[PDB]
Amino acid sequence: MSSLLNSLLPEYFKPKTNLNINSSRVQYGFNARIDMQYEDDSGTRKGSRPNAFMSNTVAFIGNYEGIIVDDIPILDGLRADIFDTHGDLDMGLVEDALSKSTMIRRNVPTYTAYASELLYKRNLTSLFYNMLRLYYIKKWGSIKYEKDAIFYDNGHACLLNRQLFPKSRDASLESSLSLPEAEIAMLDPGLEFPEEDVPAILWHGRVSSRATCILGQACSEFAPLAPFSIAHYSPQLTRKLFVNAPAGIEPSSGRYTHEDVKDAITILVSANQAYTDFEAAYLMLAQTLVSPVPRTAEASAWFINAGMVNMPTLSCANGYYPALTNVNPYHRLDTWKDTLNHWVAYPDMLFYHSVAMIESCYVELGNVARVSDSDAINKYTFTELSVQGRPVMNRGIIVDLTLVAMRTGREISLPYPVSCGLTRTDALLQGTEIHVPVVVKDIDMPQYYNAIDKDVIEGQETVIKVKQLPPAMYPIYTYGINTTEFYSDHFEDQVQVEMAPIDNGKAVFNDARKFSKFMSIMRMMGNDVTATDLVTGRKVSNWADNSSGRFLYTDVKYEGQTAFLVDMDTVKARDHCWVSIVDPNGTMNLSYKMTNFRAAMFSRNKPLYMTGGSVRTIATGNYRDAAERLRAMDETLRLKPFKITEKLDFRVAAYAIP
């Protein structure tokens, strides 16, 4: 659904068509003007950062594994005559429709008997999904993956690509897959009895030399070398695929460009009348196009074990019954062609729709992981109460759409209760300790991180014990639309730390809430604060991120009693464009204000600019008003004359309109 994913984008964000991606890492964000203030009994110290960049790093790598599951049939496409008043295939009108058609008379009785089983095999989501992945593999084919590269680095702990993804050879995305071609046979119209467990599709005119090569590779096993997101492992959809094309199927060309895959999709959707099938495949790919680079070192627990992708079995019986598909189809919603029409016009817009969906999910799974099991709406039972339909199993797209509904605070409506795609809530529901590997840089690591060893020499491979999952992404596109006090994503905020002159700089935060806001605002001001817990004896640093520049309470890496000693004569100025706290006395009052917002994207430590035309909000009415218009100007070549007009020179001629 293009419509619901479009509304997630911010108001200030004005996207263009083309986006020239030339790397496997993008820092999307915005530039804002922060007017910071520090008030005290001595006086006020004002600062101003005119261009403050708040970013979330997003990569094109992520371990996924496809499995073939059984899903509901999508009945949108079949002629409206055979359907009854309630909206189910009234068998008796099917036998009537087949009898009054251009079918062979000896096949009518035997084909009608099979109809009861074969007409309820309508799900082309798996085919469209694979054909969409082939489009983006050939478009962004020049992106590279190095084996010994830095997945994450925060100064203390480092995590390499070798650690998370073993059995991984370095190669380009184009050179990753070597897809073998499945057989594309021609359906004989005079076949005695239809062959079930072999799908048959429709086609307009002649199957081109390149269309054979695309359909051949789409219905085949994906066995990748490099762990890419749009080239993950998928099982063999089918062995053989029939195509009811009276004009013969040309043999396989071998080569094809990304423009030829768009040609193949547009013919397949139009012939089969499968637009709702495409809408399902569009939302599936939106989840599993890009995966987020973790905010903290201990936020890598989400991507340790491979999340399963639920691909519904390829099943289509249109080739055997050409009569039942015509120009008057049955559809539930009137805006059922909107998702395809959006993709054909603006293919590269999927990148923006993808980051909008994963940012919405991973933000909400952040503040869902911090609720006790003894509650009404908890970790296990947040999907059941929200869903008001009848899906087969609460997995895939249902779990991701219900998280988006919680974030935006609106009602998401789909025409069919389809349960296909990636399932994210895997590591959460387990409710056990996860052992993430790490290579150390400094020697004073295991004070900060909950490490397995207490003394570790530099360059050693250690393990961190993560119990509660910290947030993987900070809200950026969904900044101050549905604000919570955990993230504290306000435009205006203030904190009041109360100290007396008798205290020699040392302040104890009994409250946990205002400790979080103090440590966060001090980092905007470019000050390196290092607090020490009095009960346990561990240490926390506000500088625990190089992207957002905020301090969340989950950076403590421990749930206990709150007694944080901060010594305010060991505060060090780290960044540029900073206010100085030289020697405070009395009550401190910190405050900031974010005024304006400008969309910015970075890649390879350089600005990535959006190019091409101005993207519009395509509606169903905007095309069918031109159908209402029809260009009703009678196609008659009316040539109008020009009267020559003489003036002073007479050498040169001058023509007038009347």
Q: Which of residues 402-461 bind a second copy (CB under 8 A)?
A: none
- Binders in 136-165 for a second copy, by CB under 8 A: none
572 binds a second copy (CB under 8 A): no
CB of 399 to a second copy, least distance (A): 16
Q: What tokens does 438 get?
A: 């790490």
Closer by beta carbon to a second copy, 120 or else 602? 120
Q: Using CB under 8 A, which of the segments 21-29, 233-241, 499-507, 544-552 binds a second copy?
A: 499-507
CA quadruple 469, 473, 476, 481: dihedral sign: negative
Distance CA 448, CA 538 (A): 7
CB of 584 to a second copy, least distance (A): 20
45 binds a second copy (CB under 8 A): no
332 binds a second copy (CB under 8 A): no
CB of 141 to a second copy, least distance (A): 13
Q: Map residue 23 onto helix, strand or coil.
A: coil
Cα–Cα distances (Å) from 93 to 83, 84, 481, in that order, read 8, 9, 52
Tell me the CA end-to-end span of the chain in Å, nearest whole number: 53
Q: Map residue 345 onto helix, strand or coil.
A: helix
- Binders in 472-491 for a second copy, by CB under 8 A: none
Closer by beta carbon to a second copy, 110 or else 587? 110
109 binds a second copy (CB under 8 A): yes
CB of 509 to a second copy, least distance (A): 9
- Binders in 190-209 for a second copy, by CB under 8 A: 193, 196, 204-206, 208
Residue 588 and residue 512 in contact, taking contact as beta carbons nearer than 8 Å: no
Pairing of strands 539-541, 530-533: antiparallel
CB of 204 to a second copy, least distance (A): 7
In eight-state DSSP terms, residue 329 is B
Closer by beta carbon to a second copy, 4 or else 118? 118
Per-residue interface string for the shown chain with a second copy, residues 621-650, x marking contact by CB under 8 A = -xxxxx----x---x-------------x-
Closer by beta carbon to a second copy, 87 or else 180? 87
In eight-state DSSP terms, residue 248 is P
- Residue numbers after which the chain breaks, C to N beyond 2.5 angstroms: none
CA quadruple 141, 143, 147, 152: dihedral sign: negative
117 binds a second copy (CB under 8 A): yes
- Binders in 359-378 for a second copy, by CB under 8 A: 372-374
Judged by CB under 8 A, which of 104, 150, 344, 443 binds a second copy?
344
Distance CA 544, CA 554 (A): 11
330 binds a second copy (CB under 8 A): no
Distance CA 230, CA 136 (A): 8
Size of the site for a second copy (CB under 8 A): 92
Distance CA 203, CA 247 (A): 10
535 binds a second copy (CB under 8 A): yes
Q: Using CB under 8 A, which of the segments 68-76, 153-161, 223-231, 577-585 binds a second copy?
A: 68-76
Which secondary structure element, helix H or strand E, spans residue 511, and what is its range?
Answer: none
Chain mean position to CA 297: 22
501 binds a second copy (CB under 8 A): yes
Q: Using CB under 8 A, which of the segments 217-225, 284-292, 404-412, 562-570 binds a second copy?
A: 562-570
In 3D space, the residue among 162, 129, 179, 180 whose CA is nearest the CA of residue 61 turns out to be: 162
